[PDB]
Every structure is written in C-alpha cells, then in structure tokens.
Amino acid sequence: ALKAPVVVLGAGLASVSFVAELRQAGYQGLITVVGDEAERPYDRPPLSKDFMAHGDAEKIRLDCKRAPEVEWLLGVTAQSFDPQAHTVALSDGRTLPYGTLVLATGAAPRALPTLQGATMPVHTLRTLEDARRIQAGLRPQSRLLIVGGGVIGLELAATARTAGVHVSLVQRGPRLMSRAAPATLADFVARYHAAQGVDLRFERSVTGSVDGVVLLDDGTRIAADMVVVGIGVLANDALARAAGLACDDGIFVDAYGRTTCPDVYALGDVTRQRNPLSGRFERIETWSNAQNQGIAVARHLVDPTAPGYAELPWYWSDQGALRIQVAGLASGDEEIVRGEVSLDAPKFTLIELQKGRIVGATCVNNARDFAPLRRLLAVGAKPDRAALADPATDLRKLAAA
Amino acid sequence: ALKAPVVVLGAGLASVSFVAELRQAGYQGLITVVGDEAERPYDRPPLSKDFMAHGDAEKIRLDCKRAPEVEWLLGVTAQSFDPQAHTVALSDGRTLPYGTLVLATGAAPRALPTLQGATMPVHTLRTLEDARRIQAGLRPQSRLLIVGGGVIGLELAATARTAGVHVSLVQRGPRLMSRAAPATLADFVARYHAAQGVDLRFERSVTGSVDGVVLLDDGTRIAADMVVVGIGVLANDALARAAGLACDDGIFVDAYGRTTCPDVYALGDVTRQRNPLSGRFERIETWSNAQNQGIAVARHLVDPTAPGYAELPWYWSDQGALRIQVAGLASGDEEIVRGEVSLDAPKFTLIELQKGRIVGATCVNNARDFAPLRRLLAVGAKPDRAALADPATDLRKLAAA
Numbered sequence: 147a148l149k150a151p152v153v154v155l156g157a158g159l160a161s162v163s164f165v166a167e168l169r170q171a172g173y174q175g176l177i178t179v180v181g182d183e184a185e186r187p188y189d190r191p192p193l194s195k196d197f198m199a200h201g202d203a204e205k206i207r208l209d210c211k212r213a214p215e216v217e218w219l220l221g222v223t224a225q226s227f228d229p230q231a232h233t234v235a236l237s238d239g240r241t242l243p244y245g246t247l248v249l250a251t252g253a254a255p256r257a258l259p260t261l262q263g264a265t266m267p268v269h270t271l272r273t274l275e276d277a278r279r280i281q282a283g284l285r286p287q288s289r290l291l292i293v294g295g296g297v298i299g300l301e302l303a304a305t306a307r308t309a310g311v312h313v314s315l316v317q318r319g320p321r322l323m324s325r326a327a328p329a330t331l332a333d334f335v336a337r338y339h340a341a342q343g344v345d346l347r348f349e350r351s352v353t354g355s356v357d358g359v360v361l362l363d364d365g366t367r368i369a370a371d372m373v374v375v376g377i378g379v380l381a382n383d384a385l386a387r388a389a390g391l392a393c394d395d396g397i398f399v400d401a402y403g404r405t406t407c408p409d410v411y412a413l414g415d416v417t418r419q420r421n422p423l424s425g426r427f428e429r430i431e432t433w434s435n436a437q438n439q440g441i442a443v444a445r446h447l448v449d450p451t452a453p454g455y456a457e458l459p460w461y462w463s464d465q466g467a468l469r470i471q472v473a474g475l476a477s478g479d480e481e482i483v484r485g486e487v488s489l490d491a492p493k494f495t496l497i498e499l500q501k502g503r504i505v506g507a508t509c510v511n512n513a514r515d516f517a518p519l520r521r522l523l524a525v526g527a528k529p530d531r532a533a534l535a536d537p538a539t540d541l542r543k544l545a546a547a
Numbered sequence: 548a549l550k551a552p553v554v555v556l557g558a559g560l561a562s563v564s565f566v567a568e569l570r571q572a573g574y575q576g577l578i579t580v581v582g583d584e585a586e587r588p589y590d591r592p593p594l595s596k597d598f599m600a601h602g603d604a605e606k607i608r609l610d611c612k613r614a615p616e617v618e619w620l621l622g623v624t625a626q627s628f629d630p631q632a633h634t635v636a637l638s639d640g641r642t643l644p645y646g647t648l649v650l651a652t653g654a655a656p657r658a659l660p661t662l663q664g665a666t667m668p669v670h671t672l673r674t675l676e677d678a679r680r681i682q683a684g685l686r687p688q689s690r691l692l693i694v695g696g697g698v699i700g701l702e703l704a705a706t707a708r709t710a711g712v713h714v715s716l717v718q719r720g721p722r723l724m725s726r727a728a729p730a731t732l733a734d735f736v737a738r739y740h741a742a743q744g745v746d747l748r749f750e751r752s753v754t755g756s757v758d759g760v761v762l763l764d765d766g767t768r769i770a771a772d773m774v775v776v777g778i779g780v781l782a783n784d785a786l787a788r789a790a791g792l793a794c795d796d797g798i799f800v801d802a803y804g805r806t807t808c809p810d811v812y813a814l815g816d817v818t819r820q821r822n823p824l825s826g827r828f829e830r831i832e833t834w835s836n837a838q839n840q841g842i843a844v845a846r847h848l849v850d851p852t853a854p855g856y857a858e859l860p861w862y863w864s865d866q867g868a869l870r871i872q873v874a875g876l877a878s879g880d881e882e883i884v885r886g887e888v889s890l891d892a893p894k895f896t897l898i899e900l901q902k903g904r905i906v907g908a909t910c911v912n913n914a915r916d917f918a919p920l921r922r923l924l925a926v927g928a929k930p931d932r933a934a935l936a937d938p939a940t941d942l943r944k945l946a947a948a
C-alpha cells in the first residue's frame with residue numbers, strides 16, 4: 147500500500163505539502179526529497195509580486211516545520227528511475243532505493259522558437275534565480291517587452307510599471323488570460339493595464355528579432371532592452387516518459403495520484419488529471435492544486451479509507467490595484483455580474499452558471515465574497531438568479547443555508 | 548507480474564486477439580472472458596460491407612482456435628469490479644475472482660441529442676443486431692438519411708446506393724472523413740459519392756425532427772424513411788470510471804496496457820493511448836489497433852522482456868469502387884501525389900512528409916504500394932522526393948533498401 151521508504155522528486159510546494167501531510171497523518175518511515183534547485187524550498191507566487199518589488203527571499207520560503215525527519219537533497223537532479231529495481235539515479239552519483247516514488251517535478255516555461263538565436267536579453271520567469279535576473283534589469287525608463295498575456299506576464303507588467311519601466315505586451319490571441327478566465331474579466335483587465343500605460347498588442351506573434359528589436363507578424367517592430375517570455379509552461383515529465391509511464395505534456399494520474407506504473411505516484415504541476423467540473427483531464431497549474439493534491443494523495447497513502455483528491459480548482463492573481471480571484475469554469479450558459487465593472491475603484495463579482503447551477507466565480511477586490519461562492523460552487527448550488535444579482539443579497543448567508 | 552486467473556471484460560477483436568496471444572505465448576492458467584452480446588465473437592468491419600449486402604453472419608465470426616481452454620461467458624454484462632477484493636460482479640449474479648483484469652469493452656456510437664424524441668426510425672451501426680435491423684429497412688427506392696460523414700457512414704452510403712436506396716448525408720464539417728484522412732482524399736471521396744447519387748450536405752447540423760422529416764440548421768428539411776446516426780463513438784469506460792481509474796472518454800494506458808490501477812489493464816477501442824507519430828494521447832478506433840495492441844499487451848504480460856506496444860496506426864475502408872487504405876498522420880508539411888486523382892478508374896497514392904520524413908500514406912485501389920509505404924513510415928524514412936513522385940519508381944525497392 148504505502149511502502150517504505152518514500153522518495154519524492156521535486157522540492158516545490160506539491161512536494162513540501164505532500165511530505166508534511168505524510169508526517170501529520172502518522173507515517174514515521176523514511177522520507178527523502180530530491181530537489182534540483184540549490185535553494186531552501188520556496189513559494190513561487192511572490193516572484194512576480196512582492197519579491198520582484200522588495201527582493202527578500204527569506205520572506206518566501208515554504209514552512210517545512212510540519213515535515214520533521216525529512217532529508218532534503220538540494221541541488222541534486224534525479225536523472226532516471228528504474229521501476230523494477232525500485233531505485234532512483236542521482237546526478238551526484240548516488241542511488242536511492244524506494245518503496246514508494248512520488249514525481250512532483252513541476253513544469254518549465256515554454257521557449258519561444260522565433261527568439262532562439264536572439265542576441266538580446268530573453269528570460270522566462272519561473273524560479274528565484276529567474277526573478278533575481280529579471281529584477282536586475284528593471285531599470286527605470288528601460289523598455290520591457292512581455293510575450294504572452296497570461297497572469298504571470300500581467301503581474302510582471304504591473305510590477306514593472308510600478309517600478310517606472312515602460313512595458314509592451316504581445317498576445318497571440320484577441321484577449322489576455324485566455325486560459326481559465328471569463329471574457330468579462332479579461333476585457334476589464336486589458337482596460338486596467340492599458341490605463342496604467344502598458345502598450346498592449348493583440349492578435350500578433352513574434353517572428354524573430356534583429357539587433358535589439360523584436361519582429362512581429364504584421365511586419366512591424368518593437369525595440370526593447372529585455373524580453374520576458376510567458377507563453378505557458380510544459381510539464382517536467384521526462385523521467386516518467388523514459389520509465390514508460392503514460393504521459394502527454396503531463397503525467398496522467400487518477401484521484402489517488404497513481405500513475406500507470408505500480409508504486410509510482412505524481413502530484414502538482416507535473417500531472418494531467420480530472421477536472422471535476424468539466425469532467426475532462428487537464429494540467430492544472432495552480433498553487434492550490436499543488437498544495438491540495440499533495441495533501442490528498444499523502445492522506446490516502448497513509449489512510450486508504452480516505453477519499454481521493456476532490457477539490458475544485460481556483461487561483462488568484464495580484465496585478466497592481468487588482469486583487470483577482472477565480473474559481474471553477476470560465477464560462478457556462480449564463481453570467482451574473484454583481485456590482486459595476488469600472489476603472490474607478492474596481493470592485494465586482496462574476497458568477498458563472500450552467501442550467502441554474504453555479505460552475506464558476508470571479509472576485510475583483512471582493513475577497514469576502516470569494517469564500518462563500520467557492521462553497522456554493524462545491525455543492526453545485528442553484529440559488530435564485532435574481533438574488534445573485536441583487537446587491538442587497540449577502541452571499542455568506544446563502545452558503546450557510 | 549502476470550497473476551492468474553485472467554479475466555477479460557469484452558469479447559470483441561481486442562479481447563480475442565489478447566487471449567489468443569496469451570495461450571500462444573505459453574500462459575496455461577485460467578482465462579475467462581465476459582461478453583455482453585449473446586453472439587459467437589465476430590468482426591465488425593463486414594457489417595457496413597459484405598455483410599450488409601449478403602447477410603451471412605457465419606462468414607464474419609472471429610477465429611478463437613488459437614485461444615484454447617477459454618471460458619466465454621456470452622450474453623453476460625460485467626456490472627462492476629472491486630480492485631481491492633480483486634473480483635468482478637456479473638449481471639447473472641455470479642462473481643469472478645481475478646489475478647489480472649483486462650478491460651476490452653470497446654466504444655458505443657454517440658446519440659444525436661436533437662433526435663432524442665424522434666418518432667421515425669433512428670439507428671446507429673455498431674453491432675450485428677444493428678446491421679440486421681438497418682439491413683431490414685434498406686428497401687429499394689426508400690430514402691435513407693445518414694448523419695455524419697465518417698468512414699462507416701460512407702461505407703453504408705455505398706452499400707445502400709448499390710442496393711437501390713436513395714441516400715442523403717448531413718455533415719457538420721466542410722468535408723467528409725474529418726478524422727485522420729488527408730484533405731485530398733476527403734475531397735476526392737466526396738466527388739465519388741456525389742457521382743454515385745449521394746445527396747451530400749456539408750456545413751449543416753440536425754436541429755430536430757417532425758413527423759418523418761429531419762430538420763436542419765439552415766432552416767430546411769430532409770424527409771427520410773430511416774436515419775442512421777454515425778457521428779462517432781464514446782469509450783465504454785464506465786466500469787473503469789466507477790472503480791477509480793484515470794479515464795476521459797477512454798481509459799488511459801501506457802505501452803504495456805497498464806491503467807492507473809494495479810493489476811488492471813485495458814486494450815482496443817476503450818483506450819486512450821500514445822500515438823507514436825504525433826506523440827500525443829488519442830483514442831485509436833481501428834481494427835489493427837484492437838488486434839495489435841491486444842497482442843502486444845498479452846505478449847509483454849507473459850514475457851516482461853518483450854517491448855511495449857509500438858505499432859503505428861493505419862486503417863482501410865471499402866466504399867463501393869474505392870478500396871481505401873490510410874496509414875500514419877493525415878498531414879505534414881508536404882504531400883506527394885503518385886498518379887492522377889480521377890473518377891475514371893480511380894487509382895492513386897498520397898504520401899505525407901514532415902521535413903523530408905514520411906509520416907503518412909494513402910492508397911486508393913493501390914494495395915501493392917501500401918505495404919512498402921507502411922515500412923518506410925515505420926523507420927521514418929527520408930527518400931528522394933522526386934523519386935517518390937516519379938511514377939517510374941517502384942516503392943517496394945526503396946523499402947527493401
């Protein structure tokens with residue numbers, strides 16, 4: 147069932163959350179974690195937020211207190227594993243035996259093929275090292291180009307503008323946040339960033355670059371001192387692929403975290419898993435999944451009577467003045483707008499319904515509403531639609547009832 | 548590894564191929580097959596072909612000779628399985644114990660929601676019973692409407708025209724055979740069927756029906772004596788889903804046929820698996836996959852040193868005068884056309900290349916070319932493109948060299 151010793155590959159949030167839950171649940175056997183970064187395990191969301199602004203890494207470290215008696219092999223890369231011999235080969239020449247193996251290796255930013263042989267600074271933003279390297283080029287009045295209009299690029303955009311950096315952003319699609327965000331939210335977010343001086347370019351792609359200038363597919367040019375590419379990430383599933391596990395930009399797992407290989411599990415950004423709301427498999431790229439899936443898989447390993455992972459997806463994003471929170475699906479057959487959608491003191495809530503059932507919710511500067519909406523979302527509530535729009539209605543009431 | 552006893556759910560081609568390989572490979576333990584159809588196991592491709600024309604079911608039975616000492620529970624449905632207790636519950640009230648469970652339950656035709664409460668004959672074509680029921684309504688000069696332009700619908704269309712039946716066909720897309728067929732092939736196939744009197748309607752959908760007439764989304768009508776729906780199939784993965792296996796319109800499996808659940812495997816139409824040419828997961832809906840995956844998974848269960856499933860995909864279709872064969876991918880960056888594409892004695896070959904490498908091939912009334920092209924495809928050959936077009940070139944030569 148849960149066979150000792152436990153080895154976890156990756157030392158990010160999913161891994162930390164998993165090994166802490168193992169200990170809290172009562173497992174007292176060996177746990178060894180292999181982490182390729184030579185860094186005290188740390189959280190990523192600050193990297194495009196407060197960290198990029200203030201630069202104190204000792205404010206972003208994960209709490210490994212609830213994970214006593216774990217050996218963390220930092221700065222070491224797992225190079226392969228042999229699922230028959232039950233061993234992992236490490237880059238330092240050592241080998242770890244395992245009873246249970248857990249792949250928590252995350253994902254890495256996609257490169258932009260058109261900028262491959264570029265001769266100007268081109269970075270991505272995933273690691274503490276990336277953030278330090280980017281932060282060191284945020285010279286006031288310098289020009290930054292961001293490729294991709296996902297939340298991390300937008301968080302960087304807002305951080306950069308706040309630092310006095312001129313920001314341009316190129317987005318292949320007609321809208322920002324094309325992944326898991328209601329169109330109404332995306333349109334509003336574009337209006338916000340535009341108003342803050344971000345030069346937004348929709349429906350354009352990068353074709354290449356020459357001497358410090360980026361080329362676009364409309365035949366035009368954008369000069370920049372630095373490009374940050376943020377067009378999404380790819381699962382770090384190479385070990386799983388080589389060992390014969392079912393993978394496709396992500397290791398396939400069930401609700402117990404099981405891969406297709408006996409005694410090998412996977413969690414976090416590296417997994418492709420069932421979204422309970424859509425009923426489809428997808429790679430979920432959020433902080434809450436990394437933590438919550440790690441916890442669920444550990445809990446069930448120690449107590450096989452515990453249910454499989456069942457949490458519904460949600461995330462947040464801090465983009466200057468906008469505190470954004472998004473849960474569930476981006477769309478259904480109906481959207482209910484609570485409040486006015488306005489650049490003047492932005493504060494609104496969106497609710498997505500499918501045949502009367504809540505399937506998604508968004509809060510912008512409205513954190514008190516988010517928690518009740520997530521509970522209503524969780525039980526598939528079908529509240530009165532007039533009430534939901536009715537600003538008099540208090541949402542915490544409904545959830546309680 | 549391979550633990551006795553073996554239980555297989557489903558008694559179609561994948562199942563028959565698997566249990567035959569188990570015996571041929573040397574496994575002598577118990578094998579029990581559960582099949583919900585009360586029929587001697589039979590092959591499906593004849594159902595839209597020679598069978599629909601001649602009606603002799605004793606010409607379409609599968610050969611279970613290479614599978615001695617198998618108990619076939621025909622006319623029995625597996626209702627659930629318990630992967631911890633290692634048992635399967637049957638619809639006749641019995642329970643089967645298993646060491647190794649194999650899900651080979653295939654797929655079923657999708658229903659058309661717009662025709663749900665229709666009051667006219669609406670059938671799909673998957674089973675021997677379906678074919679008999681459809682064949683009994685192919686009255687000469689009757690009017691048949693087919694929904695969907697996939698190969699089975701087109702095979703039925705050609706069979707029906709040959710029987711003197713007036714045939715209309717409604718296709719949501721701009722082209723027939725939208726799944727895994729080169730556009731050049733699809734365009735030609737439309738010209739053939741049109742020339743044979745099939746009334747083709749592209750870019751239309753069915754909105755409903757009233758008193759023997761089908762309604763379309765262009766606001767028009769088609770009267771018919773019978774509708775056959777052929778808009779694709781859905782994996783029969785309900786048992787796997789209920790038991791906690793990773794599924795998404797298909798049970799996820801690696802190259803060994805392993806699901807995410809220890810001691811449970813899956814094969815054939817029910818699986819979602821890696822396509823080696825695209826490197827993506829897909830549900831492969833072909834005769835050759837059912838046979839070849841069944842054989843590979845069995846072989847590796849008996850001999851763990853054997854490689855995992857590795858065959859590249861291919862299928863054929865018989866549509867009146869057209870003997871169509873298709874291997875690999877529908878497209879690449881280049882297509883080479885061997886011969887003329889003409890309704891006058893149709894006979895041509897298509898070759899799809901990606902950066903000089905063969906990734907796909909089509910033969911129409913040109914079976915001698917198909918086998919060499921599949922071998923060239925298998926080794927990722929990069930032959931001379933001028934030679935490939937050069938009709939002088941004999942293809943069997945190249946493959947040999």
Ligand SMILES: Cc1cc2nc3c(=O)[nH]c(=O)nc-3n(C[C@H](O)[C@H](O)[C@H](O)COP(=O)(O)OP(=O)(O)OC[C@H]3O[C@@H](n4cnc5c(N)ncnc54)[C@H](O)[C@@H]3O)c2cc1C
Nearest residue numbers: 156158159160182191224251252414415431432433436461
């Ligand atoms: C800049 C940024 C901002 C974000 N903001 C938010 C946010 O506001 N809200 C939100 O919901 N989410 C946010 N996220 C997303 C979030 O942080 C991720 O979902 C989360 O980090 C995933 O955790 P993980 O443990 O699964 O993967 P990871 O954090 O990527 O950890 C995996 C670790 O394993 C390492 N590894 C990989 N391969 C090997 C190997 N062979 N051997 C050893 N180690 C290996 C990796 O290098 C990595 O260190 C943000 C992410 C980034 C990068």
Ligand SMILES: Cc1cc2nc3c(=O)[nH]c(=O)nc-3n(C[C@H](O)[C@H](O)[C@H](O)COP(=O)(O)OP(=O)(O)OC[C@H]3O[C@@H](n4cnc5c(N)ncnc54)[C@H](O)[C@@H]3O)c2cc1C
Nearest residue numbers: 557559560561583592625652653815816832833834837862
């Ligand atoms: C009309 C038609 C024409 C075709 N023509 C071609 C062709 O020319 N070329 C080609 O490449 N392919 C063709 N195919 C495709 C091909 O035949 C399939 O790919 C193949 O049948 C798949 O085999 P299978 O064993 O995986 O699934 P199946 O043949 O569907 O067998 C599965 C069996 O398991 C049964 N079952 C399901 N659930 C349970 C349960 N809970 N308990 C017990 N039994 C269960 C099913 O009813 C079914 O009998 C055709 C298919 C059809 C229907």
